[PDB]
Amino acid sequence: AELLSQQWEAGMSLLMALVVLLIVAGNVLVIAAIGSTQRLQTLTNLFITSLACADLVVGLLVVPFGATLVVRGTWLWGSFLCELWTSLDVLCVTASIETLCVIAIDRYLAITSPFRYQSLMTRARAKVIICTVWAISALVSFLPIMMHWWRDEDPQALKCYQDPGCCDFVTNRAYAIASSIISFYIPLLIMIFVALRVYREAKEQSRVMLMREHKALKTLGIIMGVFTLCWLPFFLVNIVNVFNRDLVPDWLFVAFNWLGYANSAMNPIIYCRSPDFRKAFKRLLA
Numbered sequence: 001a002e003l004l005s006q007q008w009e010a011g012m013s014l015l016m017a018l019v020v021l022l023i024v025a026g027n028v029l030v031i032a033a034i035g036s037t038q039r040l041q042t043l044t045n046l047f048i049t050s051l052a053c054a055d056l057v058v059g060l061l062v063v064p065f066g067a068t069l070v071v072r073g074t075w076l077w078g079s080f081l082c083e084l085w086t087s088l089d090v091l092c093v094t095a096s097i098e099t100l101c102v103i104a105i106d107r108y109l110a111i112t113s114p115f116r117y118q119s120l121m122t123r124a125r126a127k128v129i130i131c132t133v134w135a136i137s138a139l140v141s142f143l144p145i146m147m148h149w150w151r152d153e154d155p156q157a158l159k160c161y162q163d164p165g166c167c168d169f170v171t172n173r174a175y176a177i178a179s180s181i182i183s184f185y186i187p188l189l190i191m192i193f194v195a196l197r198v199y200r201e202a203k204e205q206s207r208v209m210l211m212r213e214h215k216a217l218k219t220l221g222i223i224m225g226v227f228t229l230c231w232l233p234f235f236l237v238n239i240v241n242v243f244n245r246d247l248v249p250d251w252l253f254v255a256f257n258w259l260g261y262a263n264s265a266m267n268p269i270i271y272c273r274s275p276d277f278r279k280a281f282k283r284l285l286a
């Protein structure tokens with residue numbers, strides 16, 4: 001009874017600590033490799049740095065908070081931090097998928113008008129693009145949350161909003177659909193649509209240089225595909241639950257959210273496809 005709980009708490013505390021360490025170490029390595037290797041300071045890698053910041057925030061704030069909730073079975077931190085934590089969760093996933101759209105659009109431009117690209121894309125514009133993405137993402141995530149537009153009137157829901165040990169994200173139907181569409185489904189459709197024209201135009205292209213470029217492209221495609229596989233299950237279930245809760249078991253819904261958090265560990269591993277990253281990772285790890 002109490003032993004079963006101690007076994008589970010200690011083992012789960014260790015797994016969680018591992019997850020945190022893998023997300024934080026991996027994304028610090030990405031940022032530090034790009035921030036200290038001139039060869040990696042391309043405009044595209046500025047967008048990768050943005051993505052690695054989203055993941056880093058997941059590692060430092062989102063996951064540790066969720067960990068205390070999984071290990072201890074209740075929300076220990078009070079109402080404000082529950083709401084902030086929820087905000088940072090919505091923020092990070094929104095910023096991630098919006099950044100992946102920008103990355104897809106950047107490559108589309110570079111591949112179809114190399115010259116217009118050259119004279120349009122500057123470091124100063126890349127910065128504005130990145131801040132614009134975070135501004136929109138901030139807007140879409142914080143405001144409806146801090147303004148309580150996600151709240152429901154259901155007796156279960158009010159039960160939780162009254163309990164300071166409860167931080168379930170129990171939302172009304174309107175918010176679930178809307179935030180899903182605005183945070184996820186619309187950017188997903190854009191990214192897929194653009195990534196496909198990228199594929200088409202890449203196939204419509206000395207040989208060594210085109211191969212190195214297509215390897216990098218494929219890396220970006222893998223980033224985009226893994227992200228979709230890690231988060232789509234949760235957002236599918238998020239919709240389906242709006243119509244009929246029973247059709248998908250609860251434990252699964254929380255697992256799918258954790259699948260989403262876990263994506264924050266994956267990119268640094270995926271970047272090891274690149275000789276340049278691999279070299280800088282080795283050099284940095286000393």
Ligand SMILES: CC(C)CCC[C@@H](C)[C@H]1CC[C@H]2[C@@H]3CC=C4C[C@@H](OC(=O)CCC(=O)O)CC[C@]4(C)[C@H]3CC[C@]12C
Nearest residue numbers: 034035036041046049050051053054057127130131134
């Ligand atoms: C608790 C949460 C809400 C923190 C959110 C932090 C954001 C405001 C971060 C996340 C991504 C960061 C950006 C990621 C990348 C860049 C590129 C960077 O370009 C450079 O001039 C130097 C980088 C290089 O060339 O190696 C300028 C800062 C900026 C816009 C960063 C500014 C701060 C941003 C938007």
Ligand SMILES: CC(C)CCC[C@@H](C)[C@H]1CC[C@H]2[C@@H]3CC=C4C[C@@H](OC(=O)CCC(=O)O)CC[C@]4(C)[C@H]3CC[C@]12C
Nearest residue numbers: 097098101102125128129132133136140182186187190
């Ligand atoms: C809220 C959801 C439904 C919108 C998701 C769409 C975004 C993922 C993408 C699609 C097109 C992107 C935009 C395409 C072009 C630009 C221009 C870009 O560059 C500049 O304006 C710099 C120009 C300068 O000041 O010199 C600023 C970012 C922005 C708005 C991008 C921000 C992100 C957008 C809106």
Ligand SMILES: CCCCCCCCCC(=O)N(CCO)C[C@@H](O)[C@@H](O)[C@@H](O)[C@@H](O)CO
Nearest residue numbers: 091127128131132133134135136137138139
């Ligand atoms: C939760 C994240 C939310 C991100 C907030 C984004 C706000 C919009 C971006 C913005 O305000 N700037 C673009 C950023 O480049 C202005 C900056 O340029 C600013 O620092 C200026 O005061 C300097 O340019 C003065 O030299």
Ligand SMILES: CCCCCCCCCC(=O)N(CCO)C[C@@H](O)[C@@H](O)[C@@H](O)[C@@H](O)CO
Nearest residue numbers: 144148149151152153172174175178179182
């Ligand atoms: C970018 C996302 C922005 C989403 C904005 C959604 C705001 C929707 C407001 C709203 O619909 N409610 C108030 C919330 O402020 C209440 C109802 O949704 C609900 O509580 C009850 O009427 C139930 O009985 C279900 O019909």
Ligand SMILES: CCCCCCCCCC(=O)N(CCO)C[C@@H](O)[C@@H](O)[C@@H](O)[C@@H](O)CO
Nearest residue numbers: 015016019069070251254255256258259262
């Ligand atoms: C309170 C109820 C929620 C309890 C469910 C918590 C699951 C623990 C989350 C976790 O860290 N992982 C399981 C994910 O659920 C391990 C991740 O590292 C994993 O996602 C990937 O590395 C694998 O897919 C590779 O096989």
Ligand SMILES: C[C@H](CCc1ccc(O)cc1)NCCc1ccc(O)c(O)c1
Nearest residue numbers: 066069070086089090169179180183257
């Ligand atoms: C913070 C919240 C809770 C996740 C959670 C809950 C319990 C746990 O034990 C572990 C994780 N997740 C929000 C996910 C979300 C992200 C984006 C959206 O648009 C949306 O509607 C919902």
Ligand code: NA
Nearest residue numbers: 160161163166
């Ligand atoms: Na509560």
